[PDB]
Amino acid sequence: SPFPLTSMDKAFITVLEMTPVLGTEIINYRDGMGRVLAQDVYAKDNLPPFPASVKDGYAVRAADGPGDRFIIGESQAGEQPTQTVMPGQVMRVTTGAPIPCGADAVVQVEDTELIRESDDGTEELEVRILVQARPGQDIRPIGHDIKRGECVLAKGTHMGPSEIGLLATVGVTEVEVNKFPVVAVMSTGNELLNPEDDLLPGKIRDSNRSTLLATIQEHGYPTINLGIVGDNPDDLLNALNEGISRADVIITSGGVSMGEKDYLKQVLDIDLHAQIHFGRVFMKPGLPTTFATLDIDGVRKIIFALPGNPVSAVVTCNLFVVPALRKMQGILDPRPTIIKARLSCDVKLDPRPEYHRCILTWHHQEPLPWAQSTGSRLMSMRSANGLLMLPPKTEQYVELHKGEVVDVMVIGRL
Amino acid sequence: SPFPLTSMDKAFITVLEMTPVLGTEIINYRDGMGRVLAQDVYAKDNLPPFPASVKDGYAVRAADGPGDRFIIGESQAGEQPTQTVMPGQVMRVTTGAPIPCGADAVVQVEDTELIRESDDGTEELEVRILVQARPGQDIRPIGHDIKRGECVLAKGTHMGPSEIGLLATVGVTEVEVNKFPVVAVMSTGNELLNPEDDLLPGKIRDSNRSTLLATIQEHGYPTINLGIVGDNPDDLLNALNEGISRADVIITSGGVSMGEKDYLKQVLDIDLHAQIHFGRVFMKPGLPTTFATLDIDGVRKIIFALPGNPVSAVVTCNLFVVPALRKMQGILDPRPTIIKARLSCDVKLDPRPEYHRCILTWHHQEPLPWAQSTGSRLMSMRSANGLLMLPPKTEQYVELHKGEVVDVMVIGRL
Ligand SMILES: Nc1ncnc2c1ncn2[C@@H]1O[C@H](COP(=O)(O)OP(=O)(O)O)[C@@H](O)[C@H]1O
Ligand SMILES: Nc1ncnc2c1ncn2[C@@H]1O[C@H](COP(=O)(O)OP(=O)(O)O)[C@@H](O)[C@H]1O
Ligand code: MOO
Ligand code: MOO
Ligand SMILES: [Ca+2]
Ligand SMILES: [Ca+2]
Ligand SMILES: [Mg+2]
Ligand SMILES: [Mg+2]
Ligand SMILES: [Mo]
Ligand SMILES: [Mo]
Ligand SMILES: [Mo]
Ligand SMILES: [Mo]
Numbered sequence: 001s002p003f004p005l006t007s008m009d010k011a012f013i014t015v016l017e018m019t020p021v022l023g024t025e026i027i028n029y030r031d032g033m034g035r036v037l038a039q040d041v042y043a044k045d046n047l048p049p050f051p052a053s054v055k056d057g058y059a060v061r062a063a064d065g066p067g068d069r070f071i072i073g074e075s076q077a078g079e080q081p082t083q084t085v086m087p088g089q090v091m092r093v094t095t096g097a098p099i100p101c102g103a104d105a106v107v108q109v110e111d112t113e114l115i116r117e118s119d120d121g122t123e124e125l126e127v128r129i130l131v132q133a134r135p136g137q138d139i140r141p142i143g144h145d146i147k148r149g150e151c152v153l154a155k156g157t158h159m160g161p162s163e164i165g166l167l168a169t170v171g172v173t174e175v176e177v178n179k180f181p182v183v184a185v186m187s188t189g190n191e192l193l194n195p196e197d198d199l200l201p202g203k204i205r206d207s208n209r210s211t212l213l214a215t216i217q218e219h220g221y222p223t224i225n226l227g228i229v230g231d232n233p234d235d236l237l238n239a240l241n242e243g244i245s246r247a248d249v250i251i252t253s254g255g256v257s258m259g260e261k262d263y264l265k266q267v268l269d270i271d272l273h274a275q276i277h278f279g280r281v282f283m284k285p286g287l288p289t290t291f292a293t294l295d296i297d298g299v300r301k302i303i304f305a306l307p308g309n310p311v312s313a314v315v316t317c318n319l320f321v322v323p324a325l326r327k328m329q330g331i332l333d334p335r336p337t338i339i340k341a342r343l344s345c346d347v348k349l350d351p352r353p354e355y356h357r358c359i360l361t362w363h364h365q366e367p368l369p370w371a372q373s374t375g376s377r378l379m380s381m382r383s384a385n386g387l388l389m390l391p392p393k394t395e396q397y398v399e400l401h402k403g404e405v406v407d408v409m410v411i412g413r414l
Numbered sequence: 415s416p417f418p419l420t421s422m423d424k425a426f427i428t429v430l431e432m433t434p435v436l437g438t439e440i441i442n443y444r445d446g447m448g449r450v451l452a453q454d455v456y457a458k459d460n461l462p463p464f465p466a467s468v469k470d471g472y473a474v475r476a477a478d479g480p481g482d483r484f485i486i487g488e489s490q491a492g493e494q495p496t497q498t499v500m501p502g503q504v505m506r507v508t509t510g511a512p513i514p515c516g517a518d519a520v521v522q523v524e525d526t527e528l529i530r531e532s533d534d535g536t537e538e539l540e541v542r543i544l545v546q547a548r549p550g551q552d553i554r555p556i557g558h559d560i561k562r563g564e565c566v567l568a569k570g571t572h573m574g575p576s577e578i579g580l581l582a583t584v585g586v587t588e589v590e591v592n593k594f595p596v597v598a599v600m601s602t603g604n605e606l607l608n609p610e611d612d613l614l615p616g617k618i619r620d621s622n623r624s625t626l627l628a629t630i631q632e633h634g635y636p637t638i639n640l641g642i643v644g645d646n647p648d649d650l651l652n653a654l655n656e657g658i659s660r661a662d663v664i665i666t667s668g669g670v671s672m673g674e675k676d677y678l679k680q681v682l683d684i685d686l687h688a689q690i691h692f693g694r695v696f697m698k699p700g701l702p703t704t705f706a707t708l709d710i711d712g713v714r715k716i717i718f719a720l721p722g723n724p725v726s727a728v729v730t731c732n733l734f735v736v737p738a739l740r741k742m743q744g745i746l747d748p749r750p751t752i753i754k755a756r757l758s759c760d761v762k763l764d765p766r767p768e769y770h771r772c773i774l775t776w777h778h779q780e781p782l783p784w785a786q787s788t789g790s791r792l793m794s795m796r797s798a799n800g801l802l803m804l805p806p807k808t809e810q811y812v813e814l815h816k817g818e819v820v821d822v823m824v825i826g827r828l
């Protein structure tokens with residue numbers, strides 16, 4: 001317009017407030033990594049479902065006390081015992097095996113001495129119990145770990161490997177979860193060639209599409225490649241319409257400044273009839289970053305029109321797009337993790353809040369990590385895992401110094 | 415045997431020392447996430463390949479100084495200009511467009527005032543240049559960012575989205591990288607049923623296979639599901655042989671203690687002819703953890719036989735298996751990230767080093783995260799992202815207290 005300068009805080013809140021939560025679907029539990037449960041999950045069985053030995057040893061009657069006992073048989077994992085242990089008798093048990101009727105404690109083998117075995121040495125016949133067992137010792141009673149009817153996972157749970165294991169444990173192999181967003185990515189500019197192309201006069205290769213698609217894929221979300229679109233409103237509208245049809249989220253880069261061949265804001269408003277919530281953000285880099293929504297038949301589509309400069313595109317993707325996607329896939333608090341780190345070098349502050357990719361590293365025993373802004377040789381074998389978040393300068397603070405503590409958004413595996 | 419108790423430090427070093435680095439393969443750069451480059455990568459073009467405007471404005475002759483200028487044409491992104499700017503003239507430029515012959519600086523539009531435009535207002539004819547340009551201002555010279563022949567990525571680089579973007583930029587769309595390990599996972603025990611099964615007497619559901627497969631998949635590695643194997647040496651040998659054929663790494667759980675129906679160590683040694691490097695580790699949980707290698711025709715297979723207890727299996731998988739896999743896929747320093755955190759609760763120390771899953775959380779402005787051992791309601795919506803690493807007790811230290819600083823291995827996204 002130019003659009004009003006929007007503060008970072010307002011822009012970020014606006015993205016989260018205006019972004020929808022996707023609907024739900026039933027998935028197989030093996031496909032649950034990173035998904036958010038949209039149902040509570042209950043156990044239909046006890047764990048353990050039988051009284052289970054926690055040791056290799058003997059199932060005994062505690063009342064018998066220590067002494068010499070006839071071994072009447074063995075309880076092995078996976079088989080329900082049929083015999084009842086009577087006074088003066090014991091049954092061999094292994095870890096995880098059921099406790100036979102008549103026994104009320106387990107004595108571990110280390111607290112015993114073998115008296116007699118078969119001539120072939122394959123069968124134990126008589127054992128000395130050296131200790132006084134406590135009633136119930138070394139037995140997991142029925143339901144000790146999980147009770148039938150217990151809620152073991154609550155709706156809203158963001159699942160990792162252990163949650164998948166718990167679903168397996170309780171036999172709940174299909175669960176309701178939020179859908180993942182499908183994210184379409186488009187590059188714009190008459191100067192852009194595909195990565196596969198040799199250069200031609202006046203042209204460069206499109207890098208943003210690759211970088212943005214990889215960023216989204218890193219977070220586990222399905223993507224759509226919408227290719228390169230030229231600087232003209234008809235082609236841009238057609239590409240946006242394809243994105244809307246095929247995806248939940250459309251990410252563009254380029255063409256959002258006020259230049260003569262920058263059409264995206266006009267197309268979003270006048271042709272697409274989308275609602276542009278902000279078109280400029282008071283931030284460095286990322287000034288022309290644009291966020292729009294489009295409501296079609298009770299479905300809200302999300303559009304991020306990011307700056308064309310490659311550094312600006314990847315920075316703004318991490319600040320605005322990734323949290324939106326986290327909200328869409330059902331994460332209750334979709335905010336990124338922000339940690340405290342020490343600056344590895346002095347840095348000049350800008351009137352705008354500043355953001356820069358960095359590498360976070362821990363040093364021996366020092367409690368806080370160091371943040372080294374990207375751009376020793378070894379500090380190049382590693383990809384950026386942080387985004388430095390530097391404050392606006394004040395009449396007081398014009399610079400931050402090496403060692404001073406700053407906020408860093410986590411954007412990669414530490 | 416019982417095998418010697420191996421210290422944690424020795425066991426860990428032994429895994430890393432004995433684990434091979436996999437060979438290399440050529441991949442498409444879009445498939446490069448998490449891969450390690452096995453070649454240096456060079457630029458074959460300059461970036462930018464032409465002198466490029468960094469602003470919307472006018473390409474000028476700095477020697478002309480400020481004043482009123484005829485606009486002879488426009489240089490738009492993607493088109494090589496044909497006209498030469500002479501004294502008294504300027505050419506309109508947009509960001510990323512080539513600088514025409516004859517011009518040596520760019521003046522941004524904000525430092526100008528328009529004098530004359532066409533009757534239709536679509537074409538600018540005359541402009542007032544308000545500033546004295548510095549030579550070369552607001553131009554990226556040829557090769558400013560990347561030079562032809564420059565090494566832009568070194569062998570050993572562990573790639574993320576920005577590295578993929580750089581490959582796209584320089585047009586190197588196929589790269590040599592280390593292979594990813596294929597990891598086969600097996601559960602053992604006559605008591606185990608599939609997750610899909612209803613319980614039967616004496617039985618429980620297999621959870622470890624799901625948890626371990628999910629853990630490995632979370633790190634991006636392909637997996638093989640070897641199912642459930644009973645407690646007998648013939649079936650175990652057959653399953654191990656299948657794993658060896660189909661995978662680079664075999665993970666088993668269960669059957670590694672000294673129980674009567676525990677055969678895995680015997681099978682690995684006597685039947686498989688593998689070299690067991692340790693069979694017990696002085697650690698809690700994880701005492702019976704076993705690591706073996708098998709060399710077949712110049713190929714080294716890796717076998718981890720983990721404890722059957724589900725908590726022990728997932729803990730030892732994170733401590734030993736994941737670093738091995740990182741080495742196999744070419745990561746030069748495969749050690750996990752360890753951070754410092756504050757204990758959320760008092761904890762009793764064991765003679766053994768202790769490990770427990772936890773959740774790491776940052777609090778407002780406090781520099782160090784808090785580590786809350788797994789097992790408010792909201793602290794259940796989140797999956798474990800840390801492994802607490804507690805020291806062995808000493809005659810002095812028998813307990814650690816809330817707030818004290820401890821080591822935590824990162825095992826999930828923070
Ligand atoms: N996909 C892309 N890959 C690499 N560079 C790009 C890409 N898109 C745009 N650029 C470059 O970024 C710079 C700014 O582009 P521009 O379209 O003006 O961004 P905006 O107008 O959105 O701020 C130009 O130098 C342009 O060539
Ligand atoms: N895949 C599995 N899923 C769930 N529980 C298991 C699994 N494998 C073993 N267990 C249980 O873990 C416990 C220890 O098993 P065990 O085979 O004795 O381990 P190890 O001998 O290797 O220490 C037993 O209670 C057993 O039923
Ligand atoms: O206008 Mo920017 O600073 O390249 O996003
Ligand atoms: O023997 Mo463990 O402590 O279950 O691995
Ligand atoms: Ca452009
Ligand atoms: Ca077993
Ligand atoms: Mg532009
Ligand atoms: Mg056992
Ligand atoms: Mo135990
Ligand atoms: Mo900017
Ligand atoms: Mo910038
Ligand atoms: Mo800029």
Ligand SMILES: [Mo]
Pocket residue numbers: none
């Ligand atoms: Mo700028």
Ligand SMILES: [Mo]
Pocket residue numbers: 287
């Ligand atoms: Mo700017």
Ligand SMILES: [Mo]
Pocket residue numbers: 257287288
């Ligand atoms: Mo800009």
Ligand SMILES: [Mo]
Pocket residue numbers: 285309312
């Ligand atoms: Mo920029």
Ligand SMILES: [Mo]
Pocket residue numbers: 468
């Ligand atoms: Mo710039």
Ligand SMILES: [Mo]
Pocket residue numbers: 697698699700701702
């Ligand atoms: Mo243990």
Ligand SMILES: [Mo]
Pocket residue numbers: 698699700
């Ligand atoms: Mo244990």
Ligand SMILES: [Mo]
Pocket residue numbers: none
């Ligand atoms: Mo144990």
Ligand SMILES: [Mo]
Pocket residue numbers: none
């Ligand atoms: Mo134990």
Ligand SMILES: [Mo]
Pocket residue numbers: 701
């Ligand atoms: Mo133990």
Ligand SMILES: [Mo]
Pocket residue numbers: 671701702
């Ligand atoms: Mo054990």
Ligand SMILES: [Mo]
Pocket residue numbers: 699723726
């Ligand atoms: Mo255990």
